[PDB]
């Protein structure tokens, strides 16, 4: 498969991927941007804290109607949320990437998420029923997620 | 010129001085105008007060906090007058506006510097002696300015210190003219050179 942003050296690097994952693209894009550049141990703790609503992700681009929170002040922002499904999907991808790191023989305590990217998957069509005998789409917005972790300490 | 042009605002007509200043800052020159309360405006005081009170009336009916900003300090009145002569909505006019600084009274950075004068904007030469005029300090004070009194006392203190400095300058020049008599025989060799070339009549 073709990753965007091939690593500067594919020997201190590990890759993880997921296609057609059933999480909201907008939520996962904000969550991925928060953990970008993080250490893998810091990111795992952070994504667990998002599930417990102890640290939020800052909704920076897709922030229409997103409410305010006190935990957005850790970042330089005002709006934040705690997307549980986006955090769990990225936690599984972090686990898969870490197991790939072990298979490549490089230690997992120096890994940093140097690349992460969320693309839009093909939408899945459902149906809703409206007032005057009308039908409107009820589409889902899945996403492809890819990541690259590199050793640096 | 590359230096900073400091102008004394006393006795200067408002728009006459503002026109000269506006062209100066457009030519890349830094201009400082001090004693903006000494600027005069042609026409009797009641006439000029009516002009500014009409300006106070012009405000945004929907939200006056967005409307015209009426600045009551004489420095800010002169600053806004110069702004009306610049293309202040372009980057060139904004840069020119940044080269101009205005002060009520004379602050300590400029009170020890010799102050220039624009003859083309002076009331003595640009106005007939029988015509009435108003003072920008009085006009501003009677329309909302809050610091006519404190600027008055600080200007008196500055003038007291300047008188002392001037009497030291007089004492120095008196000594220098006396010196030119004391060393007269060993100076006339260089004095005759000066006289034949116009300097030192």
């Amino acid at each position: 498969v073709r990753y965007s942003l091939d690593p500067e050296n594919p020997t201190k690097s590990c890759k993880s991927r997921g296609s057609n994952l059933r999480v909201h693209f907008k939520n996962t894009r904000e969550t991925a941007q928060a953990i970008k550049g993080m250490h893998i141990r810091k990111a795992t703790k952070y994504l667990k804290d998002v599930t417990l609503q102890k640290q939020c992700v800052p909704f920076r681009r897709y922030n229409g109607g997103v409410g305010r929170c006190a935990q957005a002040k850790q970042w330089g922002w005002t709006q934040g949320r705690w997307p549980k499904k986006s955090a769990e999907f990225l936690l599984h991808m972090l686990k898969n990437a870490e197991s790939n790191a072990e298979l490549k023989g490089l230690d997992v305590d120096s890994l940093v998420i140097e690349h992460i990217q969320v693309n839009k998957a093909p939408k899945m069509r459902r149906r809703t029923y409206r007032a005057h005998g009308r039908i409107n789409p009820y589409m889902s917005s899945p996403c492809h997620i890819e990541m690259i972790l590199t050793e640096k300490e | 010129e590359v230096q900073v042009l400091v102008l004394d605002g006393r006795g200067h007509l408002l728009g006459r001085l503002a026109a000269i200043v506006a062209k100066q800052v457009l030519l890349g020159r830094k201009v400082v105008v001090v004693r903006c309360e000494g600027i005069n405006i042609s026409g009797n005081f009641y006439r000029n007060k009516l002009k500014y009170l009409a300006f106070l009336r012009k405000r945004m009916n929907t939200n006056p906090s967005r409307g015209p900003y009426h600045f009551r300090a004489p420095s800010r009145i002169f600053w806004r007058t110069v702004r009306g002569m610049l293309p202040h909505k372009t980057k060139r006019g904004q840069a020119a506006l940044d080269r101009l600084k205005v002060f009520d009274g004379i602050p300590p950075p400029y009170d020890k510097k010799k102050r220039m004068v624009v003859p083309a904007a002076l009331k003595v030469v640009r106005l007939k002696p029988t015509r009435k005029f108003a003072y920008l300090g009085r006009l501003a004070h009677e329309v909302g300015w809050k610091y006519q009194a404190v600027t008055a006392t600080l200007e008196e203190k500055r003038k007291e210190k300047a008188k002392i400095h001037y009497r030291k300058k007089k004492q120095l020049m008196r000594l220098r003219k006396q010196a030119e008599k004391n060393v007269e025989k060993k100076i006339d060799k260089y004095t005759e050179v000066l006289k034949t070339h116009g300097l030192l009549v």
Binding site: - | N61, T62, N63, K146, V150
Partner: protein, 402 residues
């Protein structure tokens, strides 16, 4: 076209930023005009709204119906423990306003005052003013402090004192003290600096600032009411019952032109918690606070010369939502902005009091101390026990304990 019938507008436009106050304490915003002929005195104080009660007094207003008659009047008790002076600020008059020339604090700043400088006193290492207090003892620093006082003596027009409340003497949860600048009036800058310097670290009671039956001004923040609609915020007319989208609204928010909504139209938003000043609040009493000479002296708080009853300003069962008033207090007349235990600024009146309503001596005949936690009907514990006699709880109390 013109509206059919004339009607005054709802709500004053003099309070138009109808927003939550940026401050909780309430700043003075105007001190009384300084005249050097008067003696050196303070102009402000900090108190805490304890509660309300009512009094009985004899009116001495000639020509009125209530002349030589007894009236009752609501009063507000404001607990005012003595302030502690911890610093001096100098100000110099400039053509741009007053600007702080130099601030000199004192040694031994109290812990309660030092909590004001910390958002999190718990995790703090309490390092505030640790190096500043060291220059009050060395040689070069002490000489520098003298230079600061001399330059304040020759360049400053108005000086103020930083004073803080002793929050430890109050029954409140809060321990962090409230700092405030109080302008020193009545004298030359040298004289008021000499006065303010010898009051450093000293306690200034409310006795020295305010006097009996004078009109003062109370500055504070009103009770917050949250977001509110136009009928509660601006008291506009409620629309009829038949209205479709709702009746607690303003029907027209502007004409077609000027094609915008004006700032003068009543709209829904934050109500309450506004910074307000109220002038001409008379001081009916300055209480003495609890003392101990041989026993606990409590009588003088609410014992008028006509009552002669040993009781304090505290109602039966304590002030509701506040606690027990133990320090000095000021008994203002009428209502005062703010909730209970809200910090209030008391300021000398800017005006000149010449009317007969002012400068009228107040002689209290009775101070009500019934329970405000319901329909109280007894003034003291002793009166309640005497009226009702022994109860079952006391009957078994003497049985179990002999």
């Amino acid at each position: 076209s013109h509206r059919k019938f004339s009607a005054p507008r709802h709500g004053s436009l003099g309070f138009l930023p109808r927003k939550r106050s940026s401050r909780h304490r309430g700043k003075v915003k105007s001190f009384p005009k300084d005249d050097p002929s008067k003696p050196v005195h303070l102009t402000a104080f900090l108190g805490y709204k304890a509660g309300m009660t009512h009094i009985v007094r004899e009116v001495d207003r000639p020509g009125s119906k209530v002349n030589k008659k007894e009236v009752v009047e609501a009063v507000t008790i404001v607990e005012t423990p003595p302030m502690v002076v911890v610093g001096i600020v100098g100000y110099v008059e400039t053509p741009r306003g007053l600007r702080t020339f130099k601030t000199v604090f004192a040694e031994h700043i109290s812990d309660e005052c030092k909590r004001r400088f910390y958002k999190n006193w718990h995790k703090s290492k309490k390092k505030a003013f640790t190096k500043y207090c060291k220059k009050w003892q060395d040689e070069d620093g002490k000489k520098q402090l003298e230079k600061d006082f001399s330059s304040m003596k020759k360049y400053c027009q108005v000086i103020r004192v930083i004073a803080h409340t002793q929050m430890r003497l109050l029954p409140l949860r809060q321990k962090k003290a409230h700092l405030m600048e109080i302008q020193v009036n009545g004298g030359t800058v040298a004289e008021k600096l000499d006065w303010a310097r010898e009051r450093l670290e000293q306690q200034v009671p409310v006795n020295q600032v305010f006097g009996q039956d004078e009109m003062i001004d109370v500055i504070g923040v009103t009770k917050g009411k949250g977001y509110k609609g136009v009928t509660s915020r601006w008291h506009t007319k409620k629309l009829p019952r038949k209205t479709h989208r709702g009746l607690r609204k303003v029907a027209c928010i502007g004409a077609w032109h000027p094609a915008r909504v004006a700032f003068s139209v009543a709209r829904a938003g934050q109500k309450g918690y506004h910074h307000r000043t109220e002038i001409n609040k008379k001081i009916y009493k300055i209480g003495q606070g609890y003392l101990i000479k041989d026993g606990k002296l409590i009588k003088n708080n609410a014992s008028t010369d006509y009552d002669l009853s040993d009781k304090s300003i505290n109602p039966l069962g304590g002030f509701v939502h506040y606690g027990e008033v133990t320090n000095d207090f000021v008994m203002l007349k009428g209502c005062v902005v703010g909730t209970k235990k809200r910090v209030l600024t008391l300021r000398k009146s800017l005006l000149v009091q010449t009317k007969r309503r002012a400068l009228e001596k107040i002689d209290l005949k009775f101070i009500d101390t019934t329970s405000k936690f319901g329909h109280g009907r007894f003034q003291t514990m002793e009166e309640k026990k005497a009226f009702m006699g022994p109860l079952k709880k006391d009957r078994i109390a003497k049985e179990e304990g002999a």
